[PDB]
Structure formats: structure tokens, C-alpha cells
């Protein structure tokens, strides 16, 4: 209250009034009866325990319902002291329900930022809040997260701090599902940096960035109309002083497959449709295309038009952005020209040479265009494509391909080229976001999607999931490292294995040599391979031999399931081979490498499959992530229905598992929470077996506590000693106290008595004293009552005065 001023107006959404708190923490609570429980319709609802079926439980509800559920369908409930805890990880009850419930409660109160360990949970308000308030920004400036309530600027400032304090680079990992609202945060974090440390004695480029990436890495999904296919990583390069110096963008998965394919209700990247919109007619003639997408198979397999989108407007947006972004016209020309070649490729047709099973060009109509647009030679191109000249042994062996092999290789380049380009654009962006001024550290802001599970999981899902399963391990480790410091700082004696390790199994299976990707990228080299082919290769080699590898359990279709940290994902392998081809025909790449179109030439100097990069990029990333002090942010989406102050349970529950939140709680609940300092241990509990006495009293502040635990019908496991303190699991210390509690009833009840006794013992000494003084008073009065009416006495009375 006193503190809060800075925010003032925001306060109510950050923290609650000091009595709202007080009125909440200090209220009646019945532990033994109050509980959380399973629930068929609603995930977990709260209730009161009624009876006990010996291993069954009957509970009342909060709404009024009675259910008899297992013993482990029942979960404790935190004392009121933990109402709307800033850090759920401080709770003494690390459950599934308690976490759901905490989030939920502080949301219904309009608090969107609650921490769950290291995380910074964030829930979509679905309405407006004074939080991004220009007052807050300052408020959170120079404050450890313990000096202020849960908020993103906390994370964001601390990073900065830490940045200059430790002289280490930092990172912020934002992640959540499609509707969680990450961009929003990301952006908001970014502003934060710019504001709190500006040396413009960007802001648009920064912005303009999006609308370019979006044209290339975004598309109409059956769910969204502008779905991100994209991810991103910005490096804000801070200077030496601590003032801004550079930036760096990188784009991921704008989903290579879209470029060549598209589901029926979906569509490819926007750009294509943007361009064919005709707002800049030159473009159409320049690229040598038409305005009717049905001329480009690659891009009209699904849908072409979306009512909520104005391809014409965007085209400019895009266009203009390029410019602002500082691209050269030429490059700005490459981009375009290059984006059309790709369309053309999908139009490239072939035919079987007679009496031969070879592929021979079915015309030089399109090739011509593709060739020209890329700064290539039609012929040279069609040859390389048809008669791929390989290098098996120590030479270069000319190999012939099939019709099916070509169509697939083409597609592989189409994809390859698009990708690379996209990567380049990002780099170029980053470059502008390029100054000469020195750089000492940076703060990376990573925005990507999180593990999403769909009834239908295709190639794109694997790529993303894989990304996340990595990111997760990345955390689990940082936590292991982190944890272990405490037990080292304190002196507790806790040994434990890296928490990452648990996931290495899954990762190896994907990224290692005889793993999925490889088998995937090899087969891409076989001119006559099938999805089916690929499939078998996948099995013959991993099935039965690999645990994380499994065959789908029918319940669409599925070819293989994997066992990721979040759960089992059923993957469908159909199109993969293609999508993955956009293995790359190196002869062709050769040509690119010597194009008249510099840019094209550039893109391929580091020289091929699609997944081949994804990996390379994902490595370059996870490496950048390492030379970083990881800072985590988990974005959450309340209800599919878009309603502020509401939350579907199971929907949030999901996210929590796939988030890492529930895994951070797990790992938390494994160590030794409560840790008692030895003297603090003596005093409070001596009474339990106080006699573990001559040798427990001539004594040591440490060895004592040791000796003490000698008694009690307690788990001699659950604790652990060390140089400055004991370590204890949960509900133990709780157990201790209880025993203690009884021990005072003893102590008190007995001490009361004597008192009571004694108290009255003094009453008798008074009663007795009084004995006569009363009588005196007693009789004395009586006299008077009798006398006062007697002549003689009245006489004496009037007369009594004249005397002396």
C-alpha cells in the first residue's frame, strides 16, 4: 500500500490491498477435511471430505455434489496463507490442482502475472489493462523480483541488471499456443529495452520487420487466418556502457511444406497471393506469371482467397517494409524474382524418355522463365536436374533420374531456396537493426511456438516439437545447475543427477545419425523412394529397438508415435519426402552458386534437404541460447471462447504440461524444500525427547539436532543434514510441530493448574483475613439500626456536641 504508488493505478492488477490480503490469509481453515478432487466433467474441483471408505473417498463439492473417488483422486489444499501467491513454487502443496487453482484465482481478480518457479506465467486478459503503463515501466526499474509483484518487466529488467552485474549475456524465452498472445509480450518486452536504455541522442524498422516476415512465414491456417508458421529470435546488442548498440533478427519456420503443399482449407504463404493480387502490375510481367493462382499448382492446392485479408494492401505493406528495412532494390528485386521462380518450378514438367525409364524435359517454356528469373541457363539447368552429376568414390559419376525423382527434387530445391532466402532476409534485417559501435553483450528474445498436440501431427509438428523438447531440456538443466548451487550455498547434502538427462533419449532418436531425420533425409536421395519406403526404413531400424519409438494405437491415421516429455505424439508421414525435397541435387546448387543473381548466389555459399537446415539453424540457436543466462516466460490462453476473467480447466491444464510449468513443479518437489537452521532447530523441538539429555545438552548447535532426531517414530529418510542445516521433505516439519503441539498441552495444562490452584490459594488468605473485619462491620451497623430510634440515643446525639 505504502509501497505501491509508482503503479498506483495499475496496483490493483499487480497486487491487492493490504487487507484484501489479510482478510484472505487470516481466515478459518480445516486442513484434514478441505481438499481438491478429480472430476469427470470439470477437471478438478474443490470439496470437503465427508467420509473415508478405507481407500475410497466421499466428498462434497463446491456447487454441491457428492462423489466417492479413490485415495489418489484426492489432493490436499493449501492453507489460506497461500491464496494468490506470487510464486506458486512457494506453496507447500505442489500438486496439479493447486497450480491450476492459483492461476485461476488471481485471474478472476485480474492478475495476469503469476510466477511458477522461474517462469513468469502470463494469462491473456482479453481486455485492456493499465499494466503496460508508462508508470510501471519505471517502477520495475532497478527492482529484484522480490521487491515487486509478478510482472514481465520484472523479468525484463532483471535481465538487464544481471546483464551488467554478471557480465553475461541473457535470454528470454517466450512460448505458448497460437492464441496465448506472445508477439504482444515480445513486442512489449522489446519496447522495454529500447526505453530503459536508449542512445538515440529503429523503432519502425523494429516494427516494419514483422510485416515482411509475415508475408513469407505466415499463412491462412484452418485455425487462424494469419498463423505463424513464424518464429523469431532477436539479439539486442547492448553496448559497454549499457546503452543500445545493435539488433539481430532470425526467422524460423514460416513450415517448408506450405511452399509446395497445402491442405484443403488452408493456403500457402501470403506473399504469393499478395503478388498475384495485382496492385503492382509490373511485378506480374516482371515475374512472368499470371494473376490466376490456379496456374501455380504449388500455391493453389488449398484456398486462394481469404475475406478477412486484403492482399492488395499488404503487398504494399510488405513492399514498403522492405525498403525501410534498408534492402537494396536489386535485393528487393531478387526477393521478388526469386519468389516467382519457385512458383514456376512447380510448373516444371517432365516425361519419360522412350524405351528408357529416364526423365526427359517435357518442354522449355517454363524452365526458360525459371532460368532467367534466377540468372541461370535453361539447358544447363534441365540437365543437372535430369542427369544429376554426382561424385561417388573420388570422382564425379553422372547419375540418371526418374520422372518421379525429378518432380521430387525440384520440389526440394523450391523449398530449399525459399527457406534460405527467408533466412537471409532475417539476417539482412538484423543487419540494419548493423552499427559500427562496439558490442559487449546482448539480450536474446526468443519467440516460437510450444509443443502443441493435434489429432493430426505432420512434419511441421515434429520440427516444432523437437524444438521444444530441446528447449525444455535446456531448462531442466539450468534448474539442475541452479538448484545445486543452493544446496551448496547452504550446506545441505543433496545429490542429484541432471534433470535434462531424462530427455536425452528422445532427442537422440530424432537428431542422431540413424535417427528419424537422417532416415528422412537419406531417402530423399533415392530417386524412387516412397513415403511408404521411408516408413519401413524407419521401423526396421527403430522399432522394438527403441523405447521412445512406438507404433500408433488406432483410435486421422498415424504411422508412428514418439514419447516426448509432454506426452505421446502420433505422427503421420505423408508428404514428408516431398515437403522435405523442396537431400539436395548438388549439380543444380552448383548453378545457383554461380548465378548472375548475386543474392541467389549468396544464399547457397555455405554449401540439400529442408530438415537439413532446420537442424543447422536450430543448432546455431541452441548454441546462442547456451552462452546465455536463460530467462523464461510462459504465455497462457484462458478460454477458447475469448472471455476475460475466465478459464477452461483442462485447457489451461494442458498448457501447463507442455509448458514446462508442471515439470518445474515436479523437479521442485523432489528436493528438500524446508531447511532448518540448527539452533532454530534446537529451541523449537528440544521438547520432543528433551532427555536425549546429558550428551544432548553438554552440547553442540549441530551435533545436537543430529542426536535429537534419534527419537520419534519418524522417517529417518525424509531429512538430511549438512554443515549449516538440515534438509527436510514436505509435511515433515508439519509432523514435528504436531508432536510438539501435544507436548505443550502437557506443559501448559500442567502449568495452568498450579496457577489456578495457587490463584485460589491466595483467595483463602484474603477470605480469612477479612473474617473479622466483616463482623465488625456486620454487628456495628445492626447496633445503629436499633439505636437510632432510641430516645436516649437521640438525646446523646443532640447533646454529644456541647461536649468537649
Amino acid at each position: 500500500d505504502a509501497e505501491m504508488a509508482a503503479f498506483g493505478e495499475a496496483a490493483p492488477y499487480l497486487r491487492k490491498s493490504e487487507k484484501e490480503r489479510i482478510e484472505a490469509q487470516n481466515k478459518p481453515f480445516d486442513a484434514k477435511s478441505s481438499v481438491f478432487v478429480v472430476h469427470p466433467k470439470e477437471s478438478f474441483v474443490k470439496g470437503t471430505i465427508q467420509s473415508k471408505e478405507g481407500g475410497k473417498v466421499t466428498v462434497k463439492t463446491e456447487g454441491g455434489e457428492t462423489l466417492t473417488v479413490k485415495e489418489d483422486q484426492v489432493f490436499s489444499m493449501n492453507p489460506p496463507k497461500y491464496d494468490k501467491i506470487e510464486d506458486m513454487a512457494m506453496m507447500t502443496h505442489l500438486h496439479e490442482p493447486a497450480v491450476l487453482y492459483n492461476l485461476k484465482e488471481r485471474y478472476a481478480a485480474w492478475m495476469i502475472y503469476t510466477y511458477s518457479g522461474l517462469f513468469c506465467v502470463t494469462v491473456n486478459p482479453y481486455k485492456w489493462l493499465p499494466v503496460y503503463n508508462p508508470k510501471v515501466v519505471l517502477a520495475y526499474r532497478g527492482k529484484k523480483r522480490q521487491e515487486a509483484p509478478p510482472h514481465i518487466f520484472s523479468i525484463s529488467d532483471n535481465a538487464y541488471q544481471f546483464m551488467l552485474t554478471d557480465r553475461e549475456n541473457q535470454s528470454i524465452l517466450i512460448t505458448g499456443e497460437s492464441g496465448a498472445g506472445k508477439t504482444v509480450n515480445t513486442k512489449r518486452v522489446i519496447q522495454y529495452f529500447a526505453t530503459i536504455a536508449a542512445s538515440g541522442e529503429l523503432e519502425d524498422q523494429i516494427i516494419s520487420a514483422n510485416p515482411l516476415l509475415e508475408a513469407f512465414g505466415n499463412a491462412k491456417t484452418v485455425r487462424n487466418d494469419n498463423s505463424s508458421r513464424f518464429g523469431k529470435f532477436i539479439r539486442i546488442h547492448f553496448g559497454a556502457t549499457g546503452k543500445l548498440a545493435s539488433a539481430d533478427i532470425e526467422t524460423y519456420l514460416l513450415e517448408k511444406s506450405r511452399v509446395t503443399f497445402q491442405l484443403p482449407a488452408e493456403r500457402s504463404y501470403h506473399i504469393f497471393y499478395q503478388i498475384m493480387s495485382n496492385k503492382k502490375p509490373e511485378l506480374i510481367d516482371m515475374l512472368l506469371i499470371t494473376t490466376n493462382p490456379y496456374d501455380y499448382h504449388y500455391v493453389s492446392q488449398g484456398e486462394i482467397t481469404v475475406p478477412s485479408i486484403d492482399d492488395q494492401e499488404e503487398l504494399m505493406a510488405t513492399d514498403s517494409a522492405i525498403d525501410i528495412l534498408g534492402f537494396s532494390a536489386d535485393e528487393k528485386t531478387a526477393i521478388y524474382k526469386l519468389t516467382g521462380a519457385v512458383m514456376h518450378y512447380g510448373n516444371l514438367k517432365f516425361k519419360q524418355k522412350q524405351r528408357e525409364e529416364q526423365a526427359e524435359p517435357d518442354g522449355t517454356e517454363v524452365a526458360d522463365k525459371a532460368a532467367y528469373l534466377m540468372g541461370l541457363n535453361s539447358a544447363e539447368l534441365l540437365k543437372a536436374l535430369c542427369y544429376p552429376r554426382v561424385k561417388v568414390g573420388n570422382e564425379f559419376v553422372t547419375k540418371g533420374q526418374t520422372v518421379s525423382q525429378v518432380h521430387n527434387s525440384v520440389g526440394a530445391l523450391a523449398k530449399a531456396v525459399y527457406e534460405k532466402m527467408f533466412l537471409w532476409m532475417v539476417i539482412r534485417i538484423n543487419q540494419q537493426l548493423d552499427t559500427k559501435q562496439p558490442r559487449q553483450y546482448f539480450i536474446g528474445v526468443l519467440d516460437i511456438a510450444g509443443f502443441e498436440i493435434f489429432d493430426f501431427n505432420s512434419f511441421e509438428q515434429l520440427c516444432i516439437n523437437f524444438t521444444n523438447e530441446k528447449l525444455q531440456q535446456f531448462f531442466n538443466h539450468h534448474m539442475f545447475v541452479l538448484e545445486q548451487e543452493e544446496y551448496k550455498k547452504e550446506g545441505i547434502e543433496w545429490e542429484f543427477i541432471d534433470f535434462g538427462m531424462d530427455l536425452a533419449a528422445c532427442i537422440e532418436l530424432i537428431e542422431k545419425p540413424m535417427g528419424i531425420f537422417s532416415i528422412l533425409e537419406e531417402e530423399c536421395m533415392f530417386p524412387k523412394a516412397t513415403d511408404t519406403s521411408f516408413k519401413n526404413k524407419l521401423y526396421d531400424q527403430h522399432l522394438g529397438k527403441s523405447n521412445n519409438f512406438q507404433k500408433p494405437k488406432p483410435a486421422a491415421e498415424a504411422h508412428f508415435s514418439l514419447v516426448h516429455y509432454a506426452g505421446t505424439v502420433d505422427y503421420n508421414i505423408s508428404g514428408w519426402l516431398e515437403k522435405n525435397k523442396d537431400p539436395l541435387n548438388e549439380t543444380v546448387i552448383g548453378l545457383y552458386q554461380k548465378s548472375s543473381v548475386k543474392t541467389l548466389a549468396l544464399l547457397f555459399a555455405t554449401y540439400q534437404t529442408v530438415s537439413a537446415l532446420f537442424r543447422e539453424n536450430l543448432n546455431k540457436l541452441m548454441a546462442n541460447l547456451r552462452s546465455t543466462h536463460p530467462h523464461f516466460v510462459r504465455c497462457i490462453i484462458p478460454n477458447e471462447t475469448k472471455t476475460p476473467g475466465a478459464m477452461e480447466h483442462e485447457l489451461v491444464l494442458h498448457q501447463l504440461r507442455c509448458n514446462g510449468v508442471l515439470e518445474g513443479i515436479r523437479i521442485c518437489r523432489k528436493g528438500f524444500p524446508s531447511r532448518v537452521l540448527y539452533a532454530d532447530f534446537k529451541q523449537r523441538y528440544r521438547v520432543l525427547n528433551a532427555s536425549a539429555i546429558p550428551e544432548g545438552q553438554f552440547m553442540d548447535s549441530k551435533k545436537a539436532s543430529e542426536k535429537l532426531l534419534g527419537s520419534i517414530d519418524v522417517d529417518h529418510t525424509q531429512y538430511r543434514f549438512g554443515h549449516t542445516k538440515v534438509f527436510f521433505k514436505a509435511g515433515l516439519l508439519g509432523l514435528l510441530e504436531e508432536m510438539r503441539d501435544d507436548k505443550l498441552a502437557e506443559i501448559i495444562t500442567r502449568t495452568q493448574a498450579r496457577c489456578r490452584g495457587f490463584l485460589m490459594r491466595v483467595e483463602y488468605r484474603r477470605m480469612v483475613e477479612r473474617r473479622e473485619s466483616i463482623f465488625c462491620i456486620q454487628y456495628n451497623v445492626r447496633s445503629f439500626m436499633n439505636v437510632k430510634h432510641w430516645p436516649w440515643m437521640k438525646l446523646f446525639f443532640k447533646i454529644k456536641p456541647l461536649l468537649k
Binding site: 505443550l744 501448559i748 502449568t751 498450579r754 490452584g757 491466595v762 488468605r765
Partner: protein, 145 residues
């Protein structure tokens, strides 16, 4: 039963003149006649039956004296050993240090209770301005009747 003085003391707490004291005053008269009894113990035998204790101590000396003797048997618990020590367990920071607030609430809210009035009366100028009370001296002034 037997001794004489206790019969003389019964009339001093009659408060009617009938020589028949009540089943409630029962629990208090027992406290000054030599040695302590707890409330829960008095409440247990003969106390818990209202008509029987009213016809077994809300009465003449005949049932007073046997109830009082029944209490006399358990009174070995008068041992002071545990009862300076139990106190040091609440506020142990060097000497027999206590804080007023801790003994005041602990002996009003816990186990057998005690009225705030009676607790204020146990604290009869033994806890001066310093906030801290000296344990070892209280058990002596408490046991000193």
C-alpha cells in the same frame, strides 16, 4: 476420611449458612486444601455425573472429604522439575527469558484456557517495563503459596 481444620474451612465458603456447598464450588475448594487438581480431572470422576455429584459433593462434609482425598492421591505431580524447564522452551535466548505476550496468550487460549482477568492477576507486578519476564522467579512465586 480424616483431619479437622478442613471442616472449619468448609463453613468459610458456604455463602448461604446451610453448610451445604455446591458441585461447582467443589472444584475450587479442592485447590486451596493443600494441593492442585486440573479441570478435566475434577470433571472426570464424580464431576461428570450431575445428579450423583450433586448427591455426592453438592452437599455436606460427607462427600467433600472423600472427593478431596481422591484428588490427594494423584498429587505427586506437584514435582517442580519439569515446570521451570517447560517454560524455558517458549522463550530461550540466554537466561530464563520470556515475553509478556507469549505467556499471556498461551495461558488464555490453550489447553485448559484461563480468563484474561486471572492471567493479568498472575502477572501481578512480576513483568515490569522491560517486556521480558524472568521464568525462574515465576515458578517460585507461583509455587510459593
Amino acid at each position: 476420611d480424616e483431619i479437622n481444620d478442613f471442616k472449619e474451612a468448609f463453613l468459610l465458603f458456604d455463602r448461604t449458612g446451610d453448610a451445604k456447598i455446591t458441585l461447582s464450588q467443589v472444584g475450587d475448594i479442592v485447590r486451596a486444601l493443600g494441593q492442585n487438581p486440573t479441570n478435566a480431572e475434577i470433571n472426570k470422576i464424580l464431576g461428570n455425573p450431575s445428579k450423583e455429584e450433586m448427591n455426592a459433593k453438592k452437599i455436606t462434609f460427607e462427600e467433600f472429604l472423600p472427593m478431596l482425598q481422591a484428588a490427594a492421591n494423584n498429587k505427586d505431580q506437584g514435582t517442580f522439575e519439569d515446570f521451570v524447564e517447560g517454560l524455558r522452551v517458549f522463550d530461550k535466548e540466554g537466561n530464563g527469558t520470556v515475553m509478556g505476550a507469549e505467556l499471556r496468550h498461551v495461558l488464555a487460549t490453550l489447553g485448559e484456557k484461563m480468563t484474561e482477568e486471572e492471567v493479568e492477576e498472575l502477572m501481578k507486578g512480576q513483568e515490569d517495563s522491560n517486556g521480558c519476564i524472568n521464568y525462574e522467579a515465576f515458578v517460585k512465586h507461583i509455587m510459593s503459596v
